[PDB]
Amino acid sequence: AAKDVKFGADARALMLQGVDLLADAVAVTMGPKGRTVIIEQSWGSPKVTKDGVTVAKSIDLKDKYKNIGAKLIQDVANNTNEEAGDGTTTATVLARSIAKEGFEKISKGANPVEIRRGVMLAVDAVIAELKKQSKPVTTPEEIAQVATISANGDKEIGNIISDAMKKVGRKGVITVKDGKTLNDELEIIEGMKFDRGYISPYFINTSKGQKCEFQDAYVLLSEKKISSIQSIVPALEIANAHRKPLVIIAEDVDGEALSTLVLNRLKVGLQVVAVKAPGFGDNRKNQLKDMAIATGGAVFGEEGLTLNLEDVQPHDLGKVGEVIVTKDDAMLLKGKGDKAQIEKRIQEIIEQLDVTTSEYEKEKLNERLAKLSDGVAVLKVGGTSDVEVNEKKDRVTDALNATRAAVEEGIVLGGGCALLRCIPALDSLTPANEDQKIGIEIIKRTLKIPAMTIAKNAGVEGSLIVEKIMQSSSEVGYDAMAGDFVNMVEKGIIDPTKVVRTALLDAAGVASLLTTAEVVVTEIPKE
Amino acid sequence: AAKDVKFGADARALMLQGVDLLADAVAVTMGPKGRTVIIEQSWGSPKVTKDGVTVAKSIDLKDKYKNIGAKLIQDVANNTNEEAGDGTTTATVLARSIAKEGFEKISKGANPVEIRRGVMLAVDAVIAELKKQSKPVTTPEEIAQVATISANGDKEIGNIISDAMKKVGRKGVITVKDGKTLNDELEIIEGMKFDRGYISPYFINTSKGQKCEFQDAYVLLSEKKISSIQSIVPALEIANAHRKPLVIIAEDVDGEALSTLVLNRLKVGLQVVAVKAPGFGDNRKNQLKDMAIATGGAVFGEEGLTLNLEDVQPHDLGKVGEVIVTKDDAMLLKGKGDKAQIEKRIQEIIEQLDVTTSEYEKEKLNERLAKLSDGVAVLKVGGTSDVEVNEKKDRVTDALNATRAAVEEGIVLGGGCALLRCIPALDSLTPANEDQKIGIEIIKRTLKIPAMTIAKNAGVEGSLIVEKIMQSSSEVGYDAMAGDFVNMVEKGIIDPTKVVRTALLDAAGVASLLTTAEVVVTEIPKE
Amino acid sequence: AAKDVKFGADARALMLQGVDLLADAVAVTMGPKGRTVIIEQSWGSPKVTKDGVTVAKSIDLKDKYKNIGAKLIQDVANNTNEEAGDGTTTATVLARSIAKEGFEKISKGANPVEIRRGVMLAVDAVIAELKKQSKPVTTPEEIAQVATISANGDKEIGNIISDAMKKVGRKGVITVKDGKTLNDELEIIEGMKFDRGYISPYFINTSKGQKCEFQDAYVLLSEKKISSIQSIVPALEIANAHRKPLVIIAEDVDGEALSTLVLNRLKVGLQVVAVKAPGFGDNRKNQLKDMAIATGGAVFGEEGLTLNLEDVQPHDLGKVGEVIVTKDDAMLLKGKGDKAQIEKRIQEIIEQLDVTTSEYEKEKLNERLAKLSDGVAVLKVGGTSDVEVNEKKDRVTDALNATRAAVEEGIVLGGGCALLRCIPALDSLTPANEDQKIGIEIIKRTLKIPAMTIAKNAGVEGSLIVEKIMQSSSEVGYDAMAGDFVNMVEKGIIDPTKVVRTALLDAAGVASLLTTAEVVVTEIPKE
Numbered sequence A, B, C: 001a002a003k004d005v006k007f008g009a010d011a012r013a014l015m016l017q018g019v020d021l022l023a024d025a026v027a028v029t030m031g032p033k034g035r036t037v038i039i040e041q042s043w044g045s046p047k048v049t050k051d052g053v054t055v056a057k058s059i060d061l062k063d064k065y066k067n068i069g070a071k072l073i074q075d076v077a078n079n080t081n082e083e084a085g086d087g088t089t090t091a092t093v094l095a096r097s098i099a100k101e102g103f104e105k106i107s108k109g110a111n112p113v114e115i116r117r118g119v120m121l122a123v124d125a126v127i128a129e130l131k132k133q134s135k136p137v138t139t140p141e142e143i144a145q146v147a148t149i150s151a152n153g154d155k156e157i158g159n160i161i162s163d164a165m166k167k168v169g170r171k172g173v174i175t176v177k178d179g180k181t182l183n184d185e186l187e188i189i190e191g192m193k194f195d196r197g198y199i200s201p202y203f204i205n206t207s208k209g210q211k212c213e214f215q216d217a218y219v220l221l222s223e224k225k226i227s228s229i230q231s232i233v234p235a236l237e238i239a240n241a242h243r244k245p246l247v248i249i250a251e252d253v254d255g256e257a258l259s260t261l262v263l264n265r266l267k268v269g270l271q272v273v274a275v276k277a278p279g280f281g282d283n284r285k286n287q288l289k290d291m292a293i294a295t296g297g298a299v300f301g302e303e304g305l306t307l308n309l310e311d312v313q314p315h316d317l318g319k320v321g322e323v324i325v326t327k328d329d330a331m332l333l334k335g336k337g338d339k340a341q342i343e344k345r346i347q348e349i350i351e352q353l354d355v356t357t358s359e360y361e362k363e364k365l366n367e368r369l370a371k372l373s374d375g376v377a378v379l380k381v382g383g384t385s386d387v388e389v390n391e392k393k394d395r396v397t398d399a400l401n402a403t404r405a406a407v408e409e410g411i412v413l414g415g416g417c418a419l420l421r422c423i424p425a426l427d428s429l430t431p432a433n434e435d436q437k438i439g440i441e442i443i444k445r446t447l448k449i450p451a452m453t454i455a456k457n458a459g460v461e462g463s464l465i466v467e468k469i470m471q472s473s474s475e476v477g478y479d480a481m482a483g484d485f486v487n488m489v490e491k492g493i494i495d496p497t498k499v500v501r502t503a504l505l506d507a508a509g510v511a512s513l514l515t516t517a518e519v520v521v522t523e524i525p526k527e
């Protein structure tokens, strides 16, 4: 494999061209007055999106040297998305700013490694100052404001999310689905999320979403691991005879049973799935007993009144109206369990919470009550066609992620003002040498980029807006949608602290390492 | 000749691309921190220049649609240069701004002709306000400051020009020549500028400067026109026999004599030139008598003691050490006339100034005294090589032109602040309709361009500098060379009013007419 | 004429590539261990040379942007050659160093004009320090040492030049010619150099050297100007009738006579030339009388015993064995004048030197004695073929020019040590701002280039040699030919001060102006 080698400024310029192209494509979507990007799809209608990471992931370049910068910025956006779930456009613009400033400061006497160290020191100081200024969320109005801001100023989505978190709790289960009407609807459904993924990816039955989903399924629970093929065969014969899907929730499934399940599913078409049992020891027994009561089934392998797997009957299995499964977790909602068994269990767990005073028992009994009683919220997104539903689904997912972040940690001022107000924190640093000073100044200049980008997307000169913001009192910021300087907290323009710090950390960490390159090696394009 | 036709936005975009290229090339030279442009020459060393019109005249484009915009901007710069002699970069940047703003405002319902009318109305109001704020020049220190500012901050050139205008008067003759040493020298030489060009371009004896220049020449003066070939032949025989050049200053020279002079010069190589007599009637007789006394010659064709041209002798002609001639004017400096004749004529004119009290006689007698006594100032530009001498000669010419303008009219604040302070004058206008309002707003936005360009060339953000200037008191401006906000008049950063108003008027007049185009027709390139 | 425009770093890099190519070609010839360059000629054998300006003038590049830098360096070398006649390689390497250092220091906040000002200030300080350290030449041994050093270590050329200047004086006439034997010969010939060029270039009779040269010519002298065609015709009839060339030395020749001389020379083939008379007034009469006595002729146009041109006879003209003429000057050597007339004149001028005590008369009478008695030295260069003769002629011309410079002004240490010892002079400067400091540091780093280049051509590491030189006493330098650190003055490694200061001034003046460019405009290559 013959390769091509470039040195210094030429390679830096090509990589900066790639970075600039990707960041210019991403940046047009930022703020309340941002616009959308249309992405061609090979299998049907094009996609319309305002999400930064979605735009970033779809840009590959033909030139080998520009594609390296494009890939590094894609890594920045993807890391931000997997960590916080929001704020990928901010991370992209910060990364471009840091890369450009670092490239412009490389000379014969400069040491880019020390510049990187200074950049990291400045970012750590800024993050500490951000954590100092954070304040917690205490009222549903703040939740609605956060959700409205994250949903691009849509008040209905914020109200729906606030109502959902009021009904199922701030730490409840919330799901987003395609609707079949023109308006949005929230429904609460009883059910459990047991914090367990599938045993095998072969049970997936869809191309979109990467999930295993079944309807009107049988419930099989085993306290012990499944080993014998004749132990599992009669459950598969039962699931086949009723045409119903089957869910297996056992401590584990061995290679021979998993191979038999996968082969029977692939060849015959039985809708069977196996997943790991929730809990450990007594917590595992308790989860199996409670979920079986909610589904009207039995728990196999128990020591008291033992029921074997080899003689399983249709009435020994439970029933569930819908199931959703993924690699990380699974949910069973509308079980057919008798009300008297659920109420008995609920009352027993309510008594047990009062019997002993310890954190572990109290937490586990509260978790069992929450799983049996609170259920899940499902949000259906309305619209006229698939494209609008897909765009609104992106916005709703962003809003839910940001609201969860703002519940975990506090909130700060929105519109990029939180990073502007942390600029004075860099005046307390004493660099060890000139290169660390250069890195600190790079970060100091970078800290203004998000507000300037938001102002530029609104059609005004961002430099004047930022200058006027820095000259005002600490609670005053710029309302880009209205075009006025207002009190940010009173108007509800607020951001989660976690999103801001995650974006800053990821962008700095990747861009400062990028700016240390001297030689680039790429493969020669073939025919 | 087959042609190509384009309509609307495509043609506008191509012409704007040409305008943008030319103006981007020109704009890098603006201000105390501007840089230079290197232009390839076909016959030798490349030219290095900081002059805006020189850069503009050297850019021709291959694309037919971009070259139209380039040519129109070249017309703007050339008109500004021929009118004021300075301020061509400002005119170019103003023209680009007006063209871009006008192109961005063209729609289906817009009427560009009314937009042009509004632009012209706003420019007229701004020019009137500028004339209101002008103040005259009264001290040599102001002259030195103006010359120093126009010479790109070179104090020595300003001091030399101030000394020259002190020695020969504010309305005296000043010339720029190539020096042969490393330093600049001022020398004062007796002589006359008689406000009369050559009779024929065939007498030019150089490829650089487009002038006729001779040394140790004979002087021939005729009160009447020259007609007979035998009247002029004995003077040509005298000029030939001594190998000396000959200058003819007569009321006129006919076709046969001019043809004979041109043919004899072209074939034999006699250094002969003919020019029109200065003055009218008695003023013509007086100029011939005085200049003959300064050169020791006679005046032919006079009624008292008449001397004929047909019997001319060597001692009937005067002598002059150097002569310079062009299409517009000519100068004879170091004449051989006896001191006693000059002093007698000077004393007679000094007496005649006291004899009668009238403007016409007093003005003409003072002009005769000035021509006989003040002479001319010659500045020689020093340097190591031709390129540096050529660049410094450009700067000295700019400084002299600006100083003459600031003597004719007043001065205003420099650095683009004079146009900034005339922005409020546009708030007193009441447009007749919406298109005139659009034109007024175009001019209002344009009035900020020169200061922003000067600030950008200095490495700072021009928007913040302009915003801070507009918020300060009327006498405060930005010193780009020092980087401080200072009192402009005290620091000597001042401009002539004529240059500013000329640049604004030319730029507006051409760009507003450019922005009215809908169809462009060009010739198809050939092979 | 369509043109191409480039901005900033790209244009700078292309121009630096051109500069680097030309300077790398030139630099290989520097020092006692430098090598030669072979240049293809279109009309015959290739040229072999060690002269820097000859190599520089022969390099034109196809790329339009590299050719600009090449042309600017050619201008540097040509200016140095026309000013000093030696030291063009040093000027070229200094110019490349300054250009590279200036290009590496251009950034957004830098002001190249102030950097140029700092460069010029540093160069002025260095030149003043050089003039302080100069010492005059007092002994013939120093003359021989200077000539030997300038002739690339050839002792025979130095001895010949020293003998020539001993025989004709330090300010006598010396000429270089092609020899016809294997060895070099000096011959002293009586004759005069009268400091007058030809009247017309049409008298040139050779393709090589650009000179008019005649043998066994007639001498025509006129005190007054020649006018009548019948006044000059009988001299042309005499010159024709004897087939001899004719020299005309008169106050001037008119257009009709010059046209007649040129036409008769071009059509018939008469070897006639006309030149201006030497001296003014009485000095002109004296030069004509003395040179006529040395040639046995008469002076026409005199008031005492007047001889007319119209009746000229063969015995009224003088005779001269050889004549050399150029645009600047002319020489008549072996005249046929009788010894008794020369001796009479000589004694009369020797008496007149004692009669009155004044500078003007004493100087003019000493000049007349020197012209009548000292003559000229002719050096013939020996060799086997034309190429070797041409190379040795280049070296001899360099040696003569350097010896004349070292007679006019003093001498300094050779080998680049004189510029090294002026580095501390830059520590007494206080720059006004940071850009002037940058320029001063550029000059400080540049001042080491000549010694490093000389050491590199000798096959050793120049950095260590320069470092060891700077740590030694002021009289110690590096002998590149021997490879030892020696006392430079005792070993005779010395340079003229004028050559060093001229090279430094020219290189700085052009390169610092080059480093201020931001835009480059070139013509698009045609087909």
Ligand SMILES: Nc1ncnc2c1ncn2[C@@H]1O[C@H](COP(=O)(O)OP(=O)(O)OP(=O)(O)O)[C@@H](O)[C@H]1O
Pocket: A029, A030, A031, A032, A034, A050, A051, A052, A053, A085, A086, A087, A088, A089, A090, A091, A149, A150, A398, A413, A414, A415, A416, A450, A454, A478, A479, A480, A481, A482, A493, A494, A495
């Ligand atoms: N009315 C407003 N005025 C000013 N700033 C606002 C306003 N509304 C939202 N913002 C700010 O705009 C930013 C939201 O940008 P946006 O949602 O387009 O991108 P992001 O969070 O960087 O990433 P992603 O593409 O993943 O959503 C936040 O900083 C938010 O505080």
Ligand SMILES: Nc1ncnc2c1ncn2[C@@H]1O[C@H](COP(=O)(O)OP(=O)(O)OP(=O)(O)O)[C@@H](O)[C@H]1O
Pocket: B029, B030, B031, B032, B034, B050, B051, B052, B053, B085, B086, B087, B088, B089, B090, B091, B149, B150, B398, B413, B414, B415, B416, B450, B454, B478, B479, B480, B481, B482, B493, B494, B495
């Ligand atoms: N120290 C300074 N600070 C601020 N502005 C300055 C300073 N010195 C000069 N100026 C301004 O810079 C401008 C001079 O620009 P410049 O001479 O480069 O171009 P120009 O006059 O438009 O045209 P041209 O190319 O014909 O000279 C004037 O407006 C002058 O007032």
Ligand SMILES: Nc1ncnc2c1ncn2[C@@H]1O[C@H](COP(=O)(O)OP(=O)(O)OP(=O)(O)O)[C@@H](O)[C@H]1O
Pocket: C029, C030, C031, C032, C034, C050, C051, C052, C053, C085, C086, C087, C088, C089, C090, C091, C149, C150, C398, C413, C414, C415, C416, C450, C454, C478, C479, C480, C481, C482, C493, C494, C495
């Ligand atoms: N033996 C030596 N040791 C050290 N330096 C020497 C020695 N001989 C000569 N030099 C130095 O070498 C330089 C002579 O270089 P050279 O004659 O090749 O080029 P130049 O003078 O720059 O230009 P040109 O090509 O016009 O002659 C001088 O600085 C001289 O002092």
Ligand SMILES: [K+]
Pocket: A029, A030, A031, A034, A050, A051, A052, A089
């Ligand atoms: K976005």
Ligand SMILES: [K+]
Pocket: B029, B030, B031, B034, B050, B051, B052, B089
């Ligand atoms: K300019």
Ligand SMILES: [K+]
Pocket: C029, C030, C031, C034, C050, C051, C052, C089
């Ligand atoms: K050399």
Ligand SMILES: [Mg+2]
Pocket: A086, A087, A150, A398
């Ligand atoms: Mg968002």
Ligand SMILES: [Mg+2]
Pocket: B086, B087, B150, B398
């Ligand atoms: Mg100017």
Ligand SMILES: [Mg+2]
Pocket: C086, C087, C150, C398
């Ligand atoms: Mg030499």
